[PDB]
Amino acid sequence: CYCRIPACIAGERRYXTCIYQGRLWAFCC
Amino acid sequence: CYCRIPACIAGERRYXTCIYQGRLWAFCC
Ligand SMILES: [Cl-]
Ligand SMILES: [Cl-]
């Protein structure tokens, strides 16, 4: 899985949010 | 990378936190 901004890529589903290095990200798997 | 409760697995590094389903997770890579 990956933390992404602004959205997941094709095939992936968002499962909440990452808190990483002072930013918020979509958690995508 | 993965979001895990209660902790990352040995070999992984905790890079931050996830929020998903009203819970706090370790963000592990
Ligand atoms: Cl920001
Ligand atoms: Cl991953």
XYZ file of all heavy atoms in Angstrom:
468
model
N 0.828 -1.208 0.000
C 0.000 0.000 0.000
C 0.864 1.260 0.000
O 2.061 1.199 0.280
C -0.837 0.000 1.254
S -1.838 -1.476 1.657
N 0.260 2.405 -0.285
C 0.996 3.652 -0.441
C 0.207 4.802 0.132
O -1.038 4.832 0.035
C 1.137 3.930 -1.944
C 1.853 2.804 -2.664
C 1.176 1.696 -3.135
C 3.238 2.828 -2.778
C 1.835 0.659 -3.769
C 3.916 1.807 -3.422
C 3.201 0.726 -3.887
O 3.886 -0.266 -4.524
N 0.911 5.815 0.618
C 0.292 7.106 0.955
C 0.431 8.014 -0.254
O 1.532 8.197 -0.819
C 0.956 7.671 2.185
S 0.825 6.723 3.651
N -0.661 8.621 -0.697
C -0.692 9.431 -1.902
C -1.439 10.734 -1.716
O -2.407 10.826 -0.972
C -1.344 8.636 -3.069
C -0.766 7.258 -3.338
C -1.309 6.730 -4.640
N -0.904 5.367 -4.949
C 0.255 5.025 -5.467
N 1.191 5.943 -5.705
N 0.467 3.767 -5.767
N -1.013 11.716 -2.469
C -1.736 12.971 -2.649
C -1.846 13.171 -4.155
O -0.831 13.139 -4.822
C -0.983 14.117 -1.976
C -0.991 13.968 -0.432
C -1.510 15.482 -2.445
C 0.033 14.813 0.261
N -3.041 13.458 -4.728
C -4.311 13.764 -4.061
C -5.267 12.600 -3.993
O -6.384 12.779 -3.514
C -4.864 14.888 -4.953
C -4.488 14.406 -6.316
C -3.137 13.764 -6.174
N -4.962 11.447 -4.579
C -5.908 10.370 -4.791
C -5.158 9.072 -4.993
O -3.974 9.076 -5.181
C -6.815 10.661 -6.004
N -5.839 7.967 -4.892
C -5.294 6.655 -5.219
C -5.134 6.527 -6.729
O -5.722 7.279 -7.492
C -6.175 5.525 -4.631
S -6.398 5.696 -2.865
N -4.328 5.590 -7.152
C -4.234 5.345 -8.588
C -5.230 4.235 -8.989
O -5.835 3.610 -8.126
C -2.821 4.955 -9.045
C -2.382 3.651 -8.450
C -1.782 6.029 -8.726
C -1.286 2.944 -9.238
N -5.411 4.011 -10.282
C -6.399 3.066 -10.775
C -6.094 1.709 -10.137
O -4.932 1.296 -10.057
C -6.367 2.963 -12.286
N -7.125 1.022 -9.713
C -6.990 -0.275 -9.044
C -6.986 -0.284 -7.545
O -7.228 -1.294 -6.879
N -6.698 0.858 -6.982
C -6.549 0.974 -5.550
C -7.823 1.464 -4.866
O -8.708 2.080 -5.530
C -5.409 1.945 -5.198
C -4.026 1.459 -5.602
C -2.906 2.423 -5.303
O -3.190 3.642 -5.178
O -1.739 1.985 -5.283
N -7.942 1.131 -3.603
C -9.033 1.553 -2.759
C -8.421 2.344 -1.611
O -7.366 1.983 -1.065
C -9.783 0.316 -2.223
C -10.936 0.600 -1.320
C -12.206 0.973 -2.123
N -13.416 0.939 -1.291
C -13.952 1.997 -0.711
N -13.370 3.196 -0.781
N -15.056 1.849 -0.015
N -9.078 3.434 -1.265
C -8.662 4.240 -0.116
C -9.193 3.614 1.188
O -10.381 3.259 1.290
C -9.158 5.693 -0.250
C -8.662 6.569 0.886
C -8.987 8.008 0.719
N -8.499 8.741 1.871
C -8.596 10.039 2.056
N -9.084 10.808 1.106
N -8.102 10.555 3.159
N -8.292 3.479 2.163
C -8.575 3.012 3.505
C -8.053 4.052 4.495
O -7.029 3.860 5.185
C -7.952 1.642 3.736
C -8.437 0.543 2.835
C -7.753 0.234 1.694
C -9.584 -0.192 3.123
C -8.145 -0.806 0.868
C -10.022 -1.205 2.250
C -9.293 -1.494 1.140
O -9.709 -2.518 0.296
N -8.706 5.167 4.567
C -8.362 6.201 5.542
C -7.177 7.047 5.086
O -7.005 7.360 3.901
C -9.548 7.112 5.751
N -6.407 7.465 6.087
C -5.504 8.594 5.957
C -4.170 8.315 6.604
O -4.106 7.717 7.667
C -6.168 9.843 6.562
O -7.394 10.041 5.930
C -5.272 11.051 6.654
N -3.077 8.761 5.957
C -1.751 8.749 6.558
C -1.415 10.112 7.150
O -1.676 11.134 6.526
C -0.682 8.445 5.524
S -1.030 7.180 4.345
N -0.775 10.059 8.304
C -0.112 11.187 8.919
C 1.384 10.924 8.768
O 1.918 10.001 9.420
C -0.457 11.338 10.417
C -1.927 11.616 10.580
C 0.384 12.408 11.089
C -2.311 11.750 12.019
N 2.017 11.664 7.869
C 3.397 11.380 7.478
C 4.096 12.707 7.180
O 3.706 13.459 6.269
C 3.451 10.424 6.264
C 4.841 10.243 5.712
C 5.796 9.512 6.455
C 5.256 10.836 4.507
C 7.072 9.328 6.001
C 6.568 10.626 4.047
C 7.464 9.881 4.801
O 8.733 9.671 4.360
N 5.155 12.943 7.930
C 6.053 14.089 7.749
C 5.290 15.399 7.660
O 5.618 16.293 6.917
C 6.951 13.876 6.526
C 7.988 12.812 6.753
C 9.004 13.213 7.787
O 9.455 14.342 7.819
N 9.342 12.288 8.665
N 4.349 15.568 8.569
C 3.647 16.788 8.731
C 2.572 17.091 7.718
O 1.984 18.182 7.744
N 2.257 16.132 6.835
C 1.185 16.230 5.857
C 0.192 15.076 6.054
O 0.502 14.036 6.639
C 1.709 16.226 4.414
C 2.419 17.476 3.949
C 3.747 17.723 4.596
N 4.523 18.708 3.829
C 5.828 18.908 4.030
N 6.492 18.234 4.960
N 6.441 19.808 3.271
N -1.012 15.278 5.505
C -2.067 14.278 5.453
C -2.164 13.712 4.023
O -2.139 14.479 3.040
C -3.392 14.911 5.855
C -3.492 15.270 7.329
C -4.571 16.264 7.575
C -3.703 14.063 8.162
N -2.317 12.400 3.923
C -2.306 11.658 2.683
C -3.448 10.667 2.643
O -3.920 10.213 3.673
C -0.992 10.846 2.534
C 0.296 11.544 2.837
C 0.690 12.059 4.033
C 1.324 11.843 1.894
N 1.915 12.648 3.901
C 2.330 12.529 2.583
C 1.521 11.572 0.524
C 3.487 12.975 1.947
C 2.676 12.000 -0.076
C 3.667 12.674 0.641
N -3.897 10.309 1.442
C -4.780 9.150 1.290
C -3.955 7.870 1.440
O -2.913 7.750 0.827
C -5.428 9.157 -0.049
N -4.459 6.924 2.240
C -3.859 5.595 2.350
C -4.533 4.664 1.350
O -5.729 4.427 1.409
C -3.956 5.037 3.754
C -3.268 3.701 3.909
C -1.891 3.565 3.708
C -4.008 2.582 4.226
C -1.280 2.336 3.850
C -3.378 1.341 4.386
C -2.031 1.250 4.170
N -3.757 4.205 0.375
C -4.282 3.541 -0.829
C -3.722 2.125 -0.892
O -2.494 1.904 -0.827
C -3.836 4.307 -2.036
S -4.504 6.001 -2.113
N -4.599 1.162 -1.132
C -4.096 -0.217 -1.322
C -4.727 -0.884 -2.534
O -5.879 -0.703 -2.748
C -4.368 -1.047 -0.089
S -3.865 -0.615 1.479
N 4.262 -0.362 1.987
C 3.915 0.126 3.357
C 2.537 -0.403 3.771
O 1.683 -0.741 2.933
C 3.935 1.675 3.419
S 5.495 2.493 2.974
N 2.295 -0.435 5.065
C 1.094 -0.975 5.679
C 0.693 -0.167 6.893
O 1.533 0.466 7.516
C 1.380 -2.395 6.161
C 1.768 -3.229 4.950
C 3.112 -3.508 4.677
C 0.836 -3.582 3.991
C 3.508 -4.222 3.558
C 1.214 -4.318 2.840
C 2.568 -4.610 2.630
O 2.965 -5.317 1.491
N -0.597 -0.191 7.240
C -1.075 0.338 8.484
C -1.384 -0.843 9.388
O -2.154 -1.733 9.011
C -2.303 1.239 8.284
S -2.052 2.684 7.278
N -0.824 -0.825 10.578
C -0.864 -1.958 11.503
C -1.239 -1.556 12.938
O -0.861 -0.503 13.418
C 0.467 -2.687 11.553
C 0.976 -3.235 10.232
C 2.153 -4.150 10.479
N 2.805 -4.586 9.247
C 2.406 -5.626 8.544
N 1.300 -6.292 8.869
N 3.100 -5.980 7.482
N -1.935 -2.457 13.639
C -2.198 -2.343 15.063
C -1.755 -3.665 15.744
O -2.120 -4.695 15.251
C -3.705 -2.088 15.301
C -4.021 -0.638 14.958
C -4.042 -2.379 16.748
C -5.517 -0.311 14.885
N -1.036 -3.595 16.893
C -0.636 -2.368 17.605
C 0.675 -1.772 17.225
O 1.025 -0.712 17.741
C -0.517 -2.836 19.041
C -0.018 -4.211 18.897
C -0.668 -4.803 17.668
N 1.394 -2.410 16.299
C 2.747 -2.013 16.038
C 3.226 -2.547 14.707
O 2.678 -3.460 14.120
C 3.654 -2.507 17.182
N 4.284 -1.954 14.203
C 4.940 -2.512 13.044
C 5.539 -3.882 13.365
O 5.738 -4.254 14.500
C 6.065 -1.561 12.608
S 5.461 0.084 12.132
N 5.818 -4.647 12.328
C 6.468 -5.977 12.454
C 7.996 -5.770 12.444
O 8.496 -4.875 11.740
C 6.042 -6.870 11.246
C 4.519 -6.995 11.146
C 6.707 -8.250 11.266
C 3.884 -7.539 12.289
N 8.730 -6.609 13.194
C 10.189 -6.547 13.180
C 10.716 -6.598 11.758
O 10.362 -7.478 11.014
C 10.822 -7.624 13.998
N 11.615 -5.678 11.425
C 12.109 -5.469 10.054
C 11.553 -4.237 9.405
O 12.159 -3.695 8.501
N 10.367 -3.839 9.837
C 9.712 -2.650 9.305
C 10.148 -1.422 10.094
O 10.669 -1.529 11.219
C 8.197 -2.816 9.326
C 7.707 -3.954 8.484
C 6.190 -4.172 8.546
O 5.529 -3.704 9.493
O 5.702 -4.873 7.650
N 9.910 -0.250 9.543
C 10.114 1.000 10.229
C 8.817 1.768 10.326
O 8.048 1.886 9.345
C 11.133 1.829 9.510
C 12.528 1.365 9.764
C 13.032 1.533 11.186
N 12.849 2.903 11.633
C 13.649 3.916 11.329
N 14.776 3.706 10.639
N 13.407 5.126 11.803
N 8.567 2.288 11.525
C 7.410 3.160 11.711
C 7.700 4.545 11.151
O 8.579 5.258 11.640
C 7.015 3.263 13.194
C 5.741 4.012 13.345
C 5.156 3.934 14.672
N 4.110 4.904 14.750
C 3.634 5.320 15.904
N 4.075 4.771 17.034
N 2.697 6.232 15.932
N 6.964 4.942 10.123
C 7.149 6.213 9.426
C 6.107 7.252 9.843
O 6.232 8.398 9.477
C 7.126 5.979 7.913
C 8.486 5.554 7.367
C 8.715 4.244 7.101
C 9.530 6.452 7.224
C 9.955 3.834 6.615
C 10.746 6.058 6.738
C 10.958 4.727 6.484
O 12.187 4.307 5.968
N 5.077 6.852 10.579
C 4.021 7.749 11.082
C 2.834 6.947 11.530
O 3.016 5.880 12.104
C 4.546 8.589 12.282
N 1.656 7.488 11.250
C 0.415 6.973 11.788
C -0.648 6.950 10.695
O -0.565 7.720 9.735
C 0.010 7.770 13.036
O 1.025 7.725 14.011
C -1.367 7.622 13.562
N -1.638 6.068 10.840
C -2.843 6.083 10.003
C -4.080 6.255 10.843
O -4.102 5.873 11.995
C -2.987 4.804 9.204
S -1.451 4.048 8.688
N -5.071 6.869 10.227
C -6.393 6.948 10.822
C -7.336 6.192 9.855
O -7.413 6.532 8.685
C -6.894 8.400 10.994
C -5.986 9.165 11.943
C -8.290 8.419 11.546
C -6.308 10.600 12.012
N -8.056 5.203 10.361
C -8.953 4.409 9.534
C -9.928 3.712 10.479
O -9.551 3.139 11.498
C -8.171 3.392 8.697
C -9.033 2.398 7.993
C -9.934 2.802 7.032
C -8.904 1.023 8.255
C -10.776 1.823 6.379
C -9.676 0.092 7.658
C -10.590 0.468 6.702
O -11.335 -0.553 6.117
N -11.202 3.771 10.152
C -12.269 3.098 10.924
C -12.233 3.527 12.390
O -12.461 2.726 13.300
C -12.176 1.574 10.768
C -12.664 1.097 9.415
C -13.237 -0.330 9.389
O -13.180 -0.998 8.344
N -13.780 -0.807 10.525
N -11.944 4.806 12.637
C -12.025 5.360 13.982
C -10.933 4.892 14.919
O -11.040 5.008 16.139
N -9.868 4.364 14.351
C -8.735 3.860 15.109
C -7.423 4.490 14.594
O -7.330 4.874 13.416
C -8.654 2.326 14.969
C -9.864 1.579 15.521
C -9.762 0.119 15.244
N -10.929 -0.688 15.634
C -11.009 -1.366 16.788
N -10.060 -1.291 17.721
N -12.058 -2.116 17.020
N -6.420 4.492 15.469
C -5.069 4.925 15.173
C -4.190 3.725 14.920
O -4.131 2.805 15.759
C -4.483 5.733 16.327
C -5.045 7.103 16.541
C -4.740 7.802 17.747
C -4.974 7.920 15.309
N -3.493 3.740 13.807
C -2.624 2.658 13.364
C -1.192 3.158 13.226
O -0.960 4.320 12.964
C -3.065 2.130 11.970
C -4.516 1.808 11.827
C -5.562 2.708 11.875
C -5.103 0.530 11.625
N -6.762 2.044 11.764
C -6.497 0.706 11.562
C -4.589 -0.766 11.469
C -7.374 -0.371 11.406
C -5.450 -1.818 11.337
C -6.829 -1.613 11.282
N -0.224 2.254 13.354
C 1.166 2.527 12.960
C 1.280 2.450 11.421
O 0.798 1.508 10.815
C 2.110 1.591 13.627
N 1.908 3.446 10.827
C 2.256 3.432 9.396
C 3.668 2.886 9.269
O 4.620 3.470 9.805
C 2.181 4.850 8.813
C 2.567 4.937 7.370
C 1.953 4.153 6.430
C 3.564 5.781 6.965
C 2.310 4.236 5.111
C 3.948 5.858 5.660
C 3.319 5.064 4.714
N 3.759 1.721 8.622
C 4.969 0.863 8.626
C 5.459 0.607 7.233
O 4.705 0.181 6.379
C 4.614 -0.467 9.304
S 3.856 -0.287 10.918
N 6.752 0.811 7.009
C 7.321 0.542 5.696
C 8.567 -0.286 5.783
O 9.238 -0.356 6.780
C 7.671 1.862 4.967
S 6.326 3.019 4.771
Cl 0.335 20.606 4.552
Cl 2.618 -0.858 0.943
